[PDB]
Structures are given as C-alpha cells and as structure tokens.
Enzyme design. Structure first.
Site, mmCIF file in Angstrom:
data_model
loop_
_atom_site.group_PDB
_atom_site.id
_atom_site.type_symbol
_atom_site.label_atom_id
_atom_site.label_comp_id
_atom_site.label_asym_id
_atom_site.label_seq_id
_atom_site.Cartn_x
_atom_site.Cartn_y
_atom_site.Cartn_z
ATOM 1 C CG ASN A 233 3.191 -1.753 2.647
ATOM 2 O OD1 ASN A 233 2.748 -2.043 1.535
ATOM 3 N ND2 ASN A 233 2.411 -1.590 3.708
ATOM 4 C CB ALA B 222 -0.405 -2.489 6.267
ATOM 5 C CB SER C 215 -0.947 -0.007 1.203
ATOM 6 O OG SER C 215 -1.747 -1.177 1.216
#
Ligand code: CA
Lengths: 551, 196
Positions: free
Chosen positions: A241, A69, A1
């Site tokens: 990430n 995340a 992401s």
C-alpha cells in the site's frame, strides 16, 4: 494489502514465488470464495472476493497473479456556483446550465416507499449540496462507462500465457488497481493500470477543481504513464500500500512518506543473500506482529538516551524501550512488554503539543489518532501509520533540512525538546492511573474479529454470529502462495474460516464452515488441486448438472 | 446447444467446474455459490444495488434507507444497462450463466424448505432470484466502488477554509501544505525499482 514476489535469483530452491495478502477486513461468512474453472479455454484455480466471475487471486500453471489497492487519482471533484434564484441550475460555460435529474424509488419493509432525486452535472453526480455558500460538489470518474470492459479485461488475465499478453489486457483497465505478475520461467512483473487524466497545471490535487469550465481535463494519459516494473535487478517485487512509482504524485486520498509499512517486508530481503520458500512464507509472521512506526523513532529515542545524563533523567524508561522489537507479544490477554504501552502513550503526547494547536479541531481527530490495534473494537485491518505520525516524521526531515519558504510544525522548539517532555508526560500518564510500575506496564492485547456484516454495515448473517482470536495478526484477509518448480505449480492458500456459510435451518453448520480458521491462525496452508489428475483423484463429492442454454 | 456441467468438491469443499462453454462454466460456478453462500450473496447484491431497506429497517436510526439512496447516487443504472447489452453472446454468457446457475439451486430451496439457510427465517424474508445486472453490480459495488471511488477532496478543502479563518490567508495555506502534501517526500519507498 501486502504482496511480495521473488524470482529464482533470490530463492534457494530455484522457483518463482508469489505470495499475495489481500486486505479487505475479516468477516463471517468468508469474504472470499475459492473455485476452479476448467473448460472453454479457461483453466484457472484460486480464490476471489464476492465470488466474482473473475478470479482475483489465482494461478494457471503458466502465470500466477495478484492484486492490491490502486493508488491513483481517477476521481476529481468539481465545485460549481448555484444560482441563488434557481438552485437547480449550475454554471459551466459560458452561462447558467440546467442540472440533469433522475428520480429513484426505495422500497422499505413495513413502511411506505421513499422517493429521492439524484443530481448530475456535466462532470457527474452531485455528491454534496451547500445552499448558503451557493455551491454544489459533483463527482467525475475517469473509469465511468468502462465498468464492464474492466471486468472482462480483469477476467481475461486467466487466458494470458506470457508477460506481453498481460499488458494487452491491463491496458483495457480503467479503474486504479495494482496488478502483479509471475510465471514458470522465473519472470516477475508489476502493473498499476488506470485511465489517468491529463489535468491542468492550475489544479491543486488535494482540493476540488473549478466547475466554471476554466479547469478541465485535457484527456487521458498514454499507457507509458502507467507504472510498469518488469524483472528488477534486486530480484524481488514487494508492495504494501505504498507509492506506485518514484516519478508519481500523492492521491487526494493517499498520502505517503519515508515512513512506510512496506519497509517491514523489504528489510527481510536484505537480511540474507538466499532464502528458502519456507523462509519467504515466514516473512509474514515477522510482519503480522511487528509495529509499523517503531523503526523510524528508534534512532531519535536512542540518540536522546545516550546523550542524556544517566544521572537522573528518567533514562529508566528509555533503556527498557530500545531493546524492544516492534513485535506485540502478549500473555493470556495482557501484553508482556511495557514498551508498546509507553510507545502508544508517547505518540499521543507527541500529538498533544504538536498537531493539536496547528490542526483545526473539526478534523483534529484525523491527525491525532494513534492507529494500532486494541482489544476493544473496531479494527479496520491494516495498521499502517496515521497522518499525525507521518506529519511528525517529515517535520523531522524539515528540521534537518530547513526550507525558508516552508513552515515547520516544531517552530520554536527542537525535535528532542518535545520528545523529552512527551516521554515524561507519557510516564506521568501511565504513573497516574496504571499501577505505576514499569515492571507491570501492560495494555490488553489486540483481538482479531470477524464481523457479522460486510463493510457497508449490511448484515451477512444473524447478529452475534462472530469469531475471535487470541491473537491479532496484521496480515491479509486471505493468504495465498504460488510456487513454480520444474515439476509444476502449487497453489497454497488458507482463506478462513471456511468456504461454506451455510447453516442448516435447525442450527447445524456445514463441515466446511470453519475448517480453515485453525490453520490461518497457525500460518498453515491448504493445498488447492491444480492439475486435472489431482482434481480427478482428490475430489470427495461430485455432482453433475444437465442443461441447455437457449435464448 | 445442449451440454453437461459437473461440480466437484475437494477435501476442503471448494468447487471445480468442468464444462465446454462459457454458459456452463459459470452455470456450475453460480450454482455452487448458491449452496455455500446463499444469504451472503443475497445481502451482498442488495447492498450494492440499494435494496437493503426493502427487507430490513429502517434504522436503527434510518440507516438502511439512508444507504439505499446513497448507493443510488454512486451508480447510474442506465450506463451499466447499455454496457452489458453491447457485449457479444460469448461475453454475455458469463453473467447470464452465473445468474441462471445461482437460481437453479435457489429454486430447489423453494421446493425443498429443508435447504433454506437459518438466516432467512430469523430475518423473516424470502430469497430472491439473481439477474446479470445484479452480478455486475456486486463487482462495481465492492470492486471499483470501494477501492477506486475513494475521494477526500472536499474534506481537504474544508481544512484549508478552517485554517484560512484562523491563520489565513497568508499562513493558512502554508500549514496546509505540511498537513497535506501534493507530492510526497522523495525519500519514500516504491515497489518499482527507482533507477536502482
Ligand atoms: Ca481527485
């Protein structure tokens, strides 16, 4: 992401740009649902996964927000010795403690119901039983009992008007999640809220703690332990990430190194002093195809090539590779360049005599996988770099800066001695089967796919109903962009394929079943109506519902 | 308490809901989701509650029944039950309005069989109504249960154990620190500006 947000300092058209690319994997029907909620204090527009009450990716003309995340250890596992006599009794302190039990009923179609029993200890539910070792492993969560509080706190970022209200809502969050801030004034922020546990110094973060009550948490960290990056001197914030904050550790599941994919997005800010909104929106194309791990091995492979005897040392391979950019350009199925095929097979030959002998064979595959996409399935989503690529990279640092207490993976060999051999082995591997003509070195191009089922394996639709690309792009499942200008705000997304997974029982699909798949392919945006006047003017179909909410 | 909600479709088919309360805003929201994604949401809910095997399976090799139990392990239904109930009326309305709105259109397909998605006939089962518990489950099931429950501790320890029997216990943990590191190299990149 991947999210990257800039402020007016860096953008030519003086606007707070916030582009977020959530990575969940690609599925049919759409993983995401786009909606606008107006009324009862709420005035939001955007899209959210699993059509949540919360809008995960949206703007409200006052604040644009995004999410990736959460890279923080909120889940510790504890190992406990089971009584060889009574297997249903563990040991906490200071004697044998009886395990709790709840039984569950599972309905099966066509067959009789199957009954299971779920074990739970002082820490949490027992995930794994090992009878012969006499140990059971239990799962403890830091966010346990704060689930609905996390929903509402996430949901109420819609109400937030400024930065200081955003943390007032971020503080209530117990799960690990990366939050990103943007407003109309030119302000950008980043929060990584989580209920972080104060853990004992005896605890090795990679492995489970002891369930004999000797190794237990001391509580929850103060909110200052949460990574907070508001308005930076650089003039931009970009996440792909990676680590949450310099002064942070590696999660039991997330391990990073200096080789990080976020460098493929950061590097483009250092390219020019000031860029336009189109250029920042064009930062994605240079990231969707660019190879993630090529940036770091180039100087090692270049250093070899120049120091090599050009007489006859197979330099013919090294001279066709260094000119290659990480991009994965193909041709009607087959790759245009031999370089990515040779780089793939070179990495595997680096695993074959590096992380093969040292790594145990059981999880040997966890370290000796290459990572990047092939036409043949399956594709997770984010390419990134495998554990083996990472261990190889930090071992190069270890050779450059020797630590006598620390053990090196190279051992009796120089970094270039193995690289030289691996390149010749890769050349010998491609020469053995492949046409054996560098001028014809090709591997089939990665194909983008839309699964007919969610990530769990449970089907969202009838088996076979799938979508394909040319064409693979390493990007988000959905792409949204928020621009702020003295004029107002503009929500710019294009979640493919469509917003309607409805198939009329005859067979015909809803007009908006795939009206967002051709524009996702072409990196085009679809404008979402934000100001009421636009929603009033631009709406084609309006349906009114009459209700009374009574007990 | 009596009101009206209007669902508006743009050129691309996304709903814009207009209401005066929490109940109405999510009644229209939950309603529109039933139109666009009836089968996906049904199968999403069943996946995060653990009722997949109830409609399909088991298999091929008892995979559905193996996950339905496995998901039951990862959520305590009693904890979430009391969590939802403690919420104030206004806060409770988001989940109730959503569930009632989703069922509003879902009872049209029970009356008008022409609006039934092709998936239900091909799989040979009936659409089921949604509860406020099921709405919450979809999030904690694919929100904090997929991206926040991630744990590789047991398999990391099993690595040390295998290494400690072929190289340990002196050189078994030294190679373990190279494969898995507590703290990263300090060279790596961070989104928050590191004193720079
Ligand atoms: Ca942990």
């Amino acid at each position: 992401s991947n999210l990257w947000s800039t402020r007016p300092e860096r953008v030519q058209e003086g606007s707070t740009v916030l582009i977020n690319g959530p990575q969940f994997g690609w599925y049919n029907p759409a993983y995401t649902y786009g909606i606008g909620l107006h009324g009862a204090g709420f005035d939001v527009v955007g899209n959210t996964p699993f059509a949540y009450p919360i809008v995960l990716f949206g703007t409200n003309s006052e604040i644009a927000w995004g999410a990736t995340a959460g890279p923080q250890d909120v889940v510790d596992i504890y190992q406990e010795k089971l009584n060889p006599s009574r297997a249903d009794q563990y040991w906490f302190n200071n004697a044998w403690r009886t395990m709790e039990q709840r039984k569950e009923r599972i309905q099966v179609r066509g067959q009789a119901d199957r009954e299971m029993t779920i074990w739970r200890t002082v820490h949490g539910p027992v995930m794994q039983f090992d009878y012969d070792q006499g140990a059971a492993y239990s799962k403890k969560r830091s966010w346990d009992g704060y689930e609905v509080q996390s929903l509402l706190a996430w949901l109420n970022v819609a109400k937030a008007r400024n930065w200081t209200e955003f943390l007032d809502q971020a503080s209530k969050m117990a799960i690990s999640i990366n939050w990103y801030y943007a407003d109309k004034h030119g302000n950008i922020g980043y929060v990584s809220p989580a209920f972080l546990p104060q853990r004992p110094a005896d605890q090795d973060i990679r492995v489970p703690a002891k369930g004999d009550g000797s190794m237990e948490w001391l509580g929850i960290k103060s909110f200052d332990a949460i990574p907070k990056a508001y308005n930076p001197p650089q003039g931009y914030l970009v996440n792909w990430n990676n680590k949450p904050a310099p002064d942070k550790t590696n999660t039991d599941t997330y391990y990073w190194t200096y080789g990080d994919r976020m460098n493929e997005l950061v590097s483009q800010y250092q390219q020019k002093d000031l860029f336009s909104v189109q250029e920042i929106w064009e930062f994605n194309q240079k990231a969707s195809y660019s190879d993630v791990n090529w940036r770091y091995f180039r100087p090692h492979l270049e250093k070899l090539a120049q120091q090599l005897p050009a007489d006859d040392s197979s330099k013919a391979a090294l001279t066709m590779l260094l000119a290659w950019d990480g991009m994965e350009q193909d041709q009607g199925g087959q790759n245009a360049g031999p370089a990515r095929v040779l780089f793939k097979t070179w990495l595997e030959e680096m695993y074959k005599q590096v992380l093969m002998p040292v790594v145990p064979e059981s999880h040997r595959a966890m370290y000796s996988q290459t990572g990047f996409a092939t036409q043949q399935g399956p594709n997770p989503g984010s390419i990134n770099l495998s554990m083996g690529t990472k261990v190889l990279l930090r071992a190069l640092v270890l050779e450059a800066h020797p630590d006598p207490k620390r053990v090196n993976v190279f051992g009796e060999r120089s970094s270039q001695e193995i690289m030289h051999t691996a390149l010749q082995n890769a050349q010998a591997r491609l020469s053995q089967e492949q046409g054996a003509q560098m001028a014809r070195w090709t591997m089939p191009t990665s194909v983008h796919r839309f699964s007919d089922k969610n990530f769990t394996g449970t089907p969202q639709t009838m088996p076979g109903n799938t979508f394909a690309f040319t064409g693979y792009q390493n990007r988000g499942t959905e792409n949204n962009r928020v621009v702020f200008d003295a004029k107002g705000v503009e929500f710019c997304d294009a979640m493919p394929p469509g917003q309607s997974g409805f198939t009329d029982r005859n067979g015909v699909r809803s007009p908006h079943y795939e009206d967002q798949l051709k524009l996702y392919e072409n990196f085009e945006c679809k404008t979402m109506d934000v100001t009421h006047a636009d929603i009033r003017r631009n709406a084609q179909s309006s349906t009114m519902l009459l209700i009374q909410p009574q007990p | 308490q009596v009101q009206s909600v209007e669902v508006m479709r743009d050129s691309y088919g996304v709903p814009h809901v207009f209401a005066d309360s929490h109940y109405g805003l999510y009644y229209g929201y939950g309603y529109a989701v039933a139109q666009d994604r009836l089968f996906q949401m049904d199968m999403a809910r069943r996946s995060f509650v653990g009722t997949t095997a109830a409609v399909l399976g088991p298999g091929e090799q008892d995979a559905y029944v193996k996950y339905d139990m496995q998901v039951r392990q990862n959520f305590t239904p009693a904890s979430i039950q009391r969590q939802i109930a403690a919420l104030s009326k206004d806060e409770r309305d988001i989940f109730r309005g959503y569930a009632d709105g989703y069922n509003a259109y879902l009872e049209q397909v029970r009356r008008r069989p022409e609006l039934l998605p092709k998936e239900y006939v091909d799989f040979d089962f009936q659409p089921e109504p949604l509860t406020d518990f099921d709405v919450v489950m979809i999030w904690v099931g694919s929100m904090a249960n997929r991206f926040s429950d991630t744990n590789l501790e047991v398999t990391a320890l099993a690595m040390r154990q295998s290494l400690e029997k072929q190289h340990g216990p002196e050189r078994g943990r030294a190679l373990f620190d190279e494969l898995l590191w507590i703290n990263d190299t300090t060279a790596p990149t961070t989104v928050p500006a590191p004193a720079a």
